[PDB]
Each structure stands twice: as C-alpha cells, then as structure tokens.
Symmetry: C3
Subunit: 189 residues, 3 copies
C-alpha cells in the first residue's frame, strides 16, 4: 500500500502494522507499534507526515497537508474512524474522535480528547488534558483521571492490535454460513 | 476482501454483495440480500458485527466496536455514505444519514431516520418511527407515512442493487472518451 | 485503472486524468482531462450519471453518488476536499467543497464559492456564486475577498500539477524500513 512520488518513498517501521488497503504516499514516516487501519490515506505529496510510535490511524482516516507542511501525530496519538488531520500537530497520547477534522497549524495538547464529529479551526491551540468538542470545537472541561486511564486502555488495545495483525491477519475466503464450531470474537486473544 | 484475525473468519451469505474494495475483518456476519459498498470497513477485530438481511452499508462506511461488543444492523438497515457505526444497535429498517456517527451502546428504534452529519451519543436510545438529527442528535418529530414509504423505496433500490452487482458488476478498463453508442445510466434498471 | 461496469455501463476516463489505483469508478462516471482522483474516492454512478469536468479534483475517501436517473456534476476546477460527499448535486466552476462536507440532491453551488469544512448543504439548496458558506445546515456568511479567490485558485492549480506529477511518477513501491540521509524528502517536491 506504499506509493512513491517524485522518488520520495514512505518509511515504515518493521514493528508497525499497515493494513494492505491503507495508502501511504510520499514523505510518510511510520514509527514502531503504529496501527494503520483500512482505507487510511497518509498522503505526503505536498509536505511531510510523521506518525510517532504506538499511535494508531483508523479506518478511512485521512492525513494530508499543504506544500512544505509538517503533519505530526505524537506517540500514542489515537485517531478515530474517519477523522481528517490537515497540517496539524496531535500531541502525545491525544484522542481524536471519529469523523473529526483538525485543520492546519492547529495543535492539540497532550492527553486531550476531541469529541467525535468536531472541527478544530485552523491555527487553534488546544491545551493539554482537556475535553474539547463541537464544530468549531471549544474546551468543555478538564479530563478526569478516570477518562485518562480509559483512553490509555483504548490506545494500549490498538498497540496490541498491531501485534495481533502482524501475527495473524491474512486474506481468507469467507465462510458461506455460520457454523457451530467456528471461532468467534469470544476467541479473541 | 475478507481478512481473518486470531483465526476468526467472516461469514458472507452467497446472496449478499460485498464490493471487492470493501474490507471485512474478523467476526463479521453478512446475511442474504445485503449490499456492502466501496471502502466499507466492517472491522470485527474486537467484537462481533452482524449485518442482517436486505441491509446496505455504503461507501467509506465504518463498522467497529468495543472489545466483546456486538454491533448490530437489523433487517433493511440503511447506512448512508461515510456513516460510522460503533458498538451500537440499528433497528429494523432504519436510515442512518450520510456522514453520521452512532456511538457505543446507542440504539435507533425501528423505521427511524437519522439525518446526515448527525451524532448519536453513547448509550442514547432513539425511539422508533421518528426523525432525529443534529450533533448531538435530538428527536425532531414523528416520521410521516410518506417519509416511511420513501425510505422503503430507497432500501428496495439497494436490495435490487445487490442483485444487479452479483449479476453484472465486473472489473473493466475504462473507455478513453464518451461515445454516441456506449451504454449509459439510461440503460439501468 | 480501477473501474467497474454495471449493467454493461463502463466509466469514461480521459488519458490525461489521474485516478489513483485505489479509487473506485462504477458505472456511468465520466472523467475529463486533468482531473485528479485520490485514494478511496468512490465515484459510484450505479443509479445515475457522474460527470467530473476537466482540471477538477476529488480527494481522499470522497464519495460521489446520486439517486436513479440523477446527474451529479462537478464542473471545471471543482475542488472536492477530503471526505466530502456529493449526492446528486451541481458543483459550479472553480468551487471548493470543504473537507468532510455533505452536498445533497439538487443542491447547486454557484461558481467560485467556498464551502467550509464539515458543512451540510440541504437538498435543493441554491448557494450563490462568490461567497463563503458553512455550517450544518450550511448558511451563506459573506462575500469572498479577492485574496480568498486567488488562494483557492493556487490550491486547485496544485492539484492539476499533482495529476501530472502522479501520472509522471507515482508508483507502487516497498517502503524503506528506516529513515536515511540519502532518501528524497518533501524538500524534493516541486511545490
Ligand atoms: Ca466523514
Ligand atoms: Zn489536503
Ligand atoms: Zn473503534
Ligand atoms: Zn447514495
């Protein structure tokens, strides 16, 4: 799923999992432990994209930016389904809710959670350790210690998912019907 | 387009159509008559995903869930382009408007229509036979009898589409220019 | 070229358009010269027609669709941002559709207009030309400055250049397993 452009080749840590239906274009760098899910477009054809270690990019997420831009997800950044990151900076251990849009030059402080379906305006700087949501997103409150531990729990699970996928994910013919003896989600490691 | 993980293999009814660019991961069960469109990610690597008969999952939709979660689309569920289903229950004959987010433990009552770009918060229960929209989504009014018929029409077209795609959809090289005698949408059923 | 026919209807793609190999074109899609179509864009003309005029771009995970007998139209230099969804609508010349926006059926966007990200344009809405509109449901906000109009034009020019660059050099490649000093970087893009 990696494409070069102008001779620029993505860099993918051997310990990261890129689903074969993701797309990596150009100056994309993936550090160890990262999970890239189906139909994630990490398109570095105008600028750079760096996904730091133990981060995850989920289904049909898009990472892009303007010419000479740098789009950064710091480690354990957690990018929910359908979120769009544009020339922005995602701080360490941040959660970007599903279907959210983070615009250019925006920065999200460490541990902060952006609610689903939110829009962070261009150049907005969101402090660390808060919940921000809405469109455009506004800080709602401090995160509790409960929520912070929960978030880590979710991110830790995606870290395991990358390993599970390197170990066992493969193309298969589907079964034509349910069977009494087939493995199920209860069989999940 | 099916992927196993931890040896768990998707189940796809022979009478469903899964576009070849969709992705089914893990404990996904697809019943008869269903349509799954391009870039739909049915990612059952943490829990179970069940798509009941005559439902449709449209382009770049994502279905995911919590560990040990069960995400259910009931019969004739109608999941619009770009909508994201996360550990929720979609009632029979529901319409989830495009680009909408349905969060964990949420349930949509039978026949209800969710407007585009909406967000159903975690654990929210949307009643049957209503229109709900917004972010966060709220009930706006009862569905009309005509609106209920129009939705059913819409879904019947997707049930037909599933059959059309099993019958005739295939990879082709594109034509290099429009022509006077090439088949067109006027030739559709 | 990832094209699919349905009911024997075959997409039409100019040789001078670039369609990323992971896009999907279904049915009666007509792509003209200079268009760029990005990863996982679904142009699904299985109920109606899709026409993408020249020098336009459809970005990542964009979806284009429409109801039976509909004609969905992106005019010249139409600029459809990441994850936007167009449903049986009319995208005027040189329009910009913000990321993650939804443009519903019979909607028309007048030429040069900018739709903000995360916007929803309601069915049959006619949004005028040369304005900035945004919200869900979207609403006209004000006229567009000449600064903004030239801002947009350069961006679209960038995507016309991307089509060429991509036809010229985009290729399936195995990734490097580590950064290195000699590898080309974004500093080596024309920009
Ligand atoms: Ca979206
Ligand atoms: Zn972009
Ligand atoms: Zn998820
Ligand atoms: Zn549609």
């Amino acid at each position: 799923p990696c494409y070069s452009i102008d001779g620029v080749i993505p860099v993918v840590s051997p310990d990261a999992f890129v689903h074969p239906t993701a797309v990596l274009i150009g100056d994309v760098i993936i550090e160890a432990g990262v999970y890239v899910g189906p139909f994630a477009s990490l398109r570095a054809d105008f600028g750079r994209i760096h996904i730091n270690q133990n981060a995850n990019i989920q289904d049909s997420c898009t990472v892009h930016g303007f010419p000479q831009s740098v789009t950064l997800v710091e480690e354990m950044g957690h990018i929910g389904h359908g979120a769009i990151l544009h020339g922005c900076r995602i701080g360490k251990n941040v959660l970007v809710g599903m279907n959210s849009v983070i615009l250019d030059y925006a920065e999200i402080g460490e541990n902060t959670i952006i609610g689903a379906n939110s829009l962070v305006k261009t150049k907005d700087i969101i402090p660390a350790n808060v919940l921000a949501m809405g469109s455009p997103a506004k800080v709602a409150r401090d995160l509790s210690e409960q929520e912070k531990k929960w978030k880590t729990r979710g991110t830790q699970e995606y870290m395991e998912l990358a390993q599970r996928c390197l170990n066992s994910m493969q193309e298969v013919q589907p079964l034509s019907s349910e069977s009494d003896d087939r493995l199920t989600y209860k069989d999940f490691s």
